[PDB]
DNA sequence: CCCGGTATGACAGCCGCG
DNA sequence: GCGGCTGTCATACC
C-alpha cells in the first residue's frame, strides 16, 4: 500500500496534514515546508526551468513559506512577474506526492451527522445558538455506526428514554419502521443534560474525527450550531476542539440577498451534500429539501410526524429520535446510489487538491495544468488581477412562432472544449491579429481568408499552428483518458457477459479465479479456462469484473466533468490562463460554427430537394440545431408509409446516409477557411419528432427562444416504443405553476401533438367545467418569499411592492397575534392565491406556508373568498393561448380569426 | 474565485391620449 | 382605459 493525503492546511511557516501511512495508520504531520517561486533572468543564466512562454527562469528557494509570500508582494510594488504556484498547500502535495494517487476509502473516515434542537421561536439562528442542542447521530463509515446522542432533560421538556423495540415495530404498531438494516448499528447514549451531551459528543469527535464531514445542510446549520453552541457555554478554546489542529475561521458567505456565516474546521474537508448534488447530479429540482430529494432518488421520503417539529419532541420524543436517525440514512441512501463523496475523493486525488476545492472548477484545474506542467520542468505564470469585462455568449436563433409537424435535430460534440483544441487557443499560442470583417461576411464565406499562415477565430484572433498549445494539451489529455476508461468500462461489462453463460453449467474445484485484466478482453487462452472452473471461482470473476466496470464508470465522468468544467475556468478572471480575447475567440468561433452549418444544411436541403431559398434550420441553440423535415417527408408522400415506425426509419437513415456527410464536408470547408490546426467539429443526430401517422397531430411546435414542445419518437439512435415528450421552457416546467395546472397544460400539449384540435378543445372544455371542484392546494401557484421587509409598510404594502409578497402582507395582517398559526419565513417557497374584490382580507390575494394546509381558523374565509375566475385565466388559461397561437389552434370552438393581428385604431 | 450568460413571463408603475 | 414602454422579481437550462 503506497501512502495517500487525507486533508492538507497552511497555518503560519507549517503544513499541517492527515495522512494514511504504508500500513494504512491515519496520521498527522507537521512539515514547515520549503516552496520555491521563480523569477524571469537573462539567457546567460543555465536553468532547466522555463514558463509556457519560453523564457528562462530562475529557481528561488524560500526558507519558509512567508518569506515566498512577502517576496510576491516586493516583486508587485516592483512591477515584474512572480512566477510559480502561489498556494503552497497545492505544491506541498505535488512535491510529497508525485506519482498516480491509489487511495483505499476503507481508511478514509467518513462522516455525516443531523443535529436537533426545539425551538418555539422560530428557525434557530446558529450564529445566535440560543437553544439547546437536544439531539445528534453521528454515522461513522469506518464503524459503520449510528452514533446517537439523546438529550433527556432540557428547559422545553423531561422525556423518556428512546427505545430501540419501538423504532424497529411497524408503522400501524406504533413503530417508527426504522429498517432492520441499520437497526443492529445504531448505538444509542441518553443523557441527563445538555453540558454533558455536548462534552461527549467532543470526545467522541477526538478518538473518531471526520476527514470527510458530510450531511443535509451541515455547513449552513449544523456545524455551525454545535461550534456556537459549544463556545457559548463553555468558550471559544472549547470549541476549537472542533478542529485536529485547534484552528477555526469563522467565513462569511455574502450572497447577492443578504448574509450567512460558515465556520472553517481546520483540517477536515466539508461536503455538504446538498451543495454535492447541486453541483453533480445535474437534475434541476422544484425544491432541494432532503424530504423532497430522498422520495425523487429512494421514493421513501424522509420520515412522518404529527403537529408542528417544534412540539415534536414533548409530544412524541420516541418519533423526533426516529426521525434524526432516518435523516442521516436518507442521505447515506441517496450517497449509495448516487456515490457523490466517491466521486469528490476520485477527482481530489487526480488534480491533487483539497477535496473541498472540487466545488471550484478553477483550483481543479490550475492544479492539474500545475502538476503536468511540473513533470516538463515548466514554470506557471504569476495570476494577475482583471477587471470584470461582459463579452459576447452563444447565438440563439430567433424562431418563427408556429407549428412544426416533423423535426430532426443535431448536436456538435463538446463544442468548447472542441474549439479550444481546433483552434489552439492558449495564452503563450498567441500569434497575432487580422483585420475582422463582419462575422455575418464570415459565415456567408465572403470575407478575405484571415491567414495563410496562422489559425483563426473571426473575433480577429490569430494561433499557431506548430505550437502545441497549453491548454489545448492539457484537454486533449482528459479527452484521451476518458476514452481509454470508458474502453475499459465496456470491455469489463462485455467480459462480465461471457461469464453469465458459465453461470448456467459450472464444476467444482478447489481452485481460486485466474489472474487476469478485466480492463482488456480476453484471449484465447483464458476463454479456453472458463468451463472447468468452480461455482465458487465463477461468482468471484463476476464481482471482479463489475467491481472494474464501476472504476470505469466513475473515472470516465469524472473526466466528463472536467471537459465541461474548463469553459467556465477560462472564462473567469480570477483564473491563472485567463485571457479576455482567448474567451472570445471561443464564443465567437462557436456562433459561427452554429450559423454556418445552418447555411450548410438550407443549401444541401434545399439543392436535394428541388427547392431554392428555403430555411430548412427552423431554430438554433448554441451547440444544436433544429430542422424541419416536411420537404423531405413530402418528397416520398407519407401515404407511401405503413406506419409511424416507417417514416423514423426513413428519417434515421436520410440523417446518417446523406445530412451527416454533408455536415463533414461543410465544416472541412470551415477548417480550412479559418485555416486550424484541426477538423474537430463533430455533428451527432439527436432528436427525429413528428405526429403519429394517420392522426391530426401537430408533432411539435414553438413559441419562442428556448420555449418549445416536441413528440419524440428516437433519441440519439434509440427506439422509443411509445411517443416521449419534450418540452423546454413552457410553463408545465415551472414550479411557480400549480400543481392540477402543470398536469392539465402537458395534456393539453400531449393532446396538441398527438392527437390535434378538436382533441385539445374537447379537453379545455371539461377542466373548465371541472376546476372549482380540484383540490385548492393543487390549484394554486407557487412562489419564494424574498424582500419581505423591504416592501412592508406597517403591515401593508408599499412602492414597487409584487404580487406574492402583497399576498404575505395580508396574510399577516389575517393571522396578527396568533403564534400557533404558522409563520412565511424569508427565502422559504409560498402558496398563492387570489381573492374576490370586496373580501374580510385586506388586498386582492392571500399567501400562506407551502407544502401546508392553511390554519383552520382562516381556512373557511379563503375558500369562500377564491377568485376562481382570476385564477385559471392567469395561471392556465393565459399560458395555453400562448401555445395555441404559435402553433396556430384554437382551444375554443369559435373564435374569430382575426384577433391574430395587431390593427391599427392609433 | 462553492455557475452565472442568453433567455421569457408576471407584475408595478409610468407616459401619452380630447 | 390601455398599449408601450422600463424596472423588479422569479425561474428555466446548456
Redesign the pocket.
Known amino acids: 500500500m503506497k501512502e495517500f493525503y487525507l486533508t492538507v492546511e497552511q497555518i503560519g511557516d507549517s503544513i499541517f496534514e492527515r495522512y494514511i501511512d504504508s500500513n494504512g495508520r491515519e496520521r498527522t504531520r507537521e512539515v514547515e515546508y520549503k516552496p520555491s517561486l521563480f523569477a524571469h533572468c537573462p539567457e546567460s543564466q543555465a536553468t532547466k526551468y522555463f514558463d509556457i512562454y519560453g523564457k528562462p527562469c530562475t529557481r528561488k528557494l524560500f526558507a519558509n513559506m512567508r518569506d515566498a509570500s512577502q517576496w510576491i508582494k516586493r516583486m508587485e510594488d516592483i512591477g515584474l512577474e512572480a512566477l510559480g504556484m502561489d498556494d503552497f498547500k497545492l505544491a506541498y502535495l505535488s512535491d510529497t506526492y508525485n506519482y498516480e494517487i491509489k487511495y483505499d476509502h476503507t481508511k478514509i473516515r467518513v462522516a455525516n451527522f443531523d443535529i436537533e434542537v426545539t425551538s418555539p421561536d422560530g428557525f434557530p439562528e446558529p450564529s445566535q445558538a440560543k437553544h439547546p442542542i437536544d439531539a445528534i447521530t453521528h454515522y461513522d463509515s469506518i464503524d459503520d455506526r449510528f452514533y446517537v446522542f439523546d438529550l433527556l432533560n432540557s428547559p422545553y421538556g423531561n422525556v423518556e428514554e428512546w427505545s430501540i423495540e419501538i423504532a424497529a415495530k411497524l408503522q400501524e404498531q406504533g413503530g417508527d419502521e426504522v429498517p432492520s438494516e441499520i437497526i443492529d448499528k445504531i448505538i444509542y447514549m441518553p443523557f441527563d443534560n445538555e453540558k454533558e451531551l455536548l462534552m461527549e459528543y467532543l470526545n467522541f469527535w477526538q478518538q473518531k474525527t471526520p476527514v470527510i464531514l458530510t450531511g443535509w445542510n451541515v455547513?449552513s446549520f449544523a456545524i455551525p450550531y454545535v461550534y456556537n453552541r459549544i463556545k457559548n457555554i463553555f468558550g471559544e478554546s472549547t470549541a476549537k476542539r472542533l478542529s485536529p489542529h485547534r484552528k477555526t475561521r469563522v467565513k462569511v458567505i455574502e450572497n447577492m440577498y443578504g448574509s450567512r456565516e460558515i465556520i472553517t474546521l481546520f483540517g477536515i474537508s466539508?461536503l455538504?451534500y446538498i451543495?454535492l448534488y447541486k453541483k453533480f447530479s445535474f437534475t434541476?429540482q422544484?425544491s432541494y429539501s432532503l424530504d423532497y430529494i430522498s422520495e425523487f432518488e429512494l421514493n421513501v421520503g424522509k420520515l412522518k410526524y404529527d403537529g408542528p417539529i417544534s412540539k415534536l419532541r414533548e409530544s412524541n420524543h420516541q418519533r423526533y429520535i426516529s426521525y434524526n436517525i432516518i435523516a442521516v440514512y436518507r442521505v447515506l441512501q441517496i450517497d449509495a446510489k448516487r456515490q457523490f463523496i466517491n466521486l469528490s475523493l476520485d477527482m481530489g486525488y487526480y488534480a491533487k487538491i483539497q477535496i473541498?476545492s472540487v466545488?471550484?472548477?478553477?483550483?481543479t484545474w490550475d492544479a492539474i495544468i500545475f502538476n503536468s506542467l511540473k513533470e516538463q520542468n515548466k514554470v506557471i505564470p504569476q495570476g494577475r488581477s482583471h477587471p470584470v469585462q461582459?463579452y459576447?455568449?452563444?447565438?440563439?436563433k430567433?424562431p418563427i412562432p408556429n407549428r412544426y409537424k416533423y423535426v430532426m435535430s443535431f448536436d456538435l460534440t463538446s463544442l468548447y472544449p472542441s474549439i479550444i483544441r481546433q483552434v489552439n487557443i492558449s495564452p503563450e499560442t498567441i500569434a497575432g491579429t487580422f483585420k475582422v470583417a463582419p462575422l455575418h461576411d464570415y459565415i456567408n464565406a465572403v470575407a478575405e481568408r484571415p491567414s495563410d499562415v496562422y489559425s483563426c477565430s473571426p473575433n480577429g484572433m490569430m494561433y499557431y499552428k506548430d505550437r502545441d498549445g497549453v491548454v489545448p494539451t492539457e484537454i486533449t489529455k482528459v479527452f484521451n483518458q476518458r476514452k481509454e476508461h470508458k474502453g475499459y468500462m465496456l470491455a469489463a461489462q462485455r467480459n462480465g457477459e461471457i461469464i453469465k453463460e458459465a453461470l448456467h453449467n459450472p464444476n467444482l474445484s478447489v481452485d481460486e479465479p485466474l489472474d487476469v485484466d478485466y480492463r482488456f478482453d480476453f484471449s484465447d487462452e483464458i476463454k479456453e479456462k472458463i468451463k472447468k472452473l468452480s461455482a465458487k471461482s465463477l461468482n468471484e470473476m463476476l464481482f471482479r469484473a463489475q467491481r472494474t466496470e464501476v472504476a470505469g464508470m466513475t473515472a470516465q465522468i469524472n473526466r466528463k466533468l472536467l471537459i465541461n468544467s474548463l469553459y467556465?475556468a477560462l472564462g473567469?478572471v480570477?483564473f491563472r490562463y485567463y485571457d479576455l480575447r482567448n474567451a472570445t475567440a471561443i464564443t465567437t468561433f462557436g456562433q459561427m460554427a452554429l450559423q454556418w452549418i445552418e447555411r450548410k444544411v438550407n443549401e444541401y436541403l434545399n439543392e436535394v430537394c428541388g427547392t431554392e431559398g428555403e430555411a430548412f434550420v427552423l431554430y438554433g441553440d448554441?451547440?444544436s440545431i433544429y430542422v424541419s423535415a416536411d420537404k423531405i417527408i413530402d418528397k416520398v408522400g407519407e401515404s407511401k408509409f405503413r406506419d409511424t415506425n416507417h417514416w423514423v426509419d426513413f428519417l434515421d437513415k436520410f440523417a446518417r446516409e446523406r445530412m451527416e456527410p454533408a455536415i463533414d464536408r461543410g465544416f472541412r470547408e470551415m477548417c480550412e477557411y479559418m485555416n486550424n490546426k484541426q477538423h474537430l467539429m463533430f455533428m451527432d443526430r439527436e432528436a427525429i419528432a413528428g405526429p403519429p401517422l394517420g392522426s391530426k397531430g401537430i408533432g411539435g411546435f414553438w413559441?419562442?427562444?428556448?420555449?418549445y414542445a416536441l413528440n419524440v419518437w428516437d433519441m440519439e439512435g434509440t427506439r422509443y416504443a411509445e411517443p416521449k415528450l419534450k418540452?423546454?421552457?413552457l410553463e408545465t416546467?415551472?414550479?411557480?405553476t400549480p400543481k392540477a395546472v402543470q398536469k392539465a397544460l402537458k395534456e393539453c400539449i400531449r393532446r396538441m401533438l398527438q392527437e390535434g384540435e378538436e382533441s385539445l378543445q374537447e379537453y379545455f372544455k371539461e377542466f373548465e367545467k371541472e376546476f372549482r371542484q380540484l383540490n385548492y392546494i393543487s390549484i394554486a401557484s407557487?412562489?419564494?418569499?424574498?424582500?419581505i421587509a423591504?416592501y412592508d409598510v406597517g403591515g401593508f404594502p408599499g412602492?414597487?411592492?409584487?404580487?406574492?409578497?402583497?399576498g404575505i402582507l395580508t396574510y399577516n395582517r389575517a393571522i396578527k397575534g396568533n403564534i400557533d398559526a404558522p409563520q412565511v419565513v424569508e427565502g422559504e417557497?409560498v402558496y398563492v392565491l387570489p381573492l374576490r374584490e370586496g373580501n374580510p382580507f385586506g388586498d386582492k390575494c392571500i399567501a400562506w406556508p407551502s407544502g401546508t394546509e392553511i390554519t383552520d381558523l382562516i381556512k373557511d374565509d379563503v375558500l369562500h373568498w377564491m377568485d376562481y375566475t382570476v385564477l385559471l385565466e392567469?395561471t392556465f388559461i393565459?399560458?395555453l393561448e400562448?401555445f395555441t397561437s404559435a402553433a396556430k389552434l384554437d382551444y375554443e370552438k369559435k373564435a374569430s380569426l382575426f384577433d391574430m393581428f395587431?390593427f391599427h385604431h392609433?
Not at 359 to 363: A, G, V, Y
Not at 733 to 736: F, T
Request: glycine share 8%.
Open positions: 455547513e466539508v455538504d451543495d434541476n422544484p473541498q466545488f471550484s472548477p478553477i483550483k461582459p459576447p455568449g452563444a447565438f440563439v430567433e467556465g473567469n480570477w448554441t451547440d413559441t419562442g427562444k428556448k420555449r418540452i423546454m421552457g416546467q415551472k414550479s411557480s407557487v412562489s419564494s418569499a424574498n424582500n423591504k412602492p414597487k411592492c409584487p404580487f406574492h409578497i402583497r417557497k392567469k393565459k399560458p400562448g395587431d392609433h
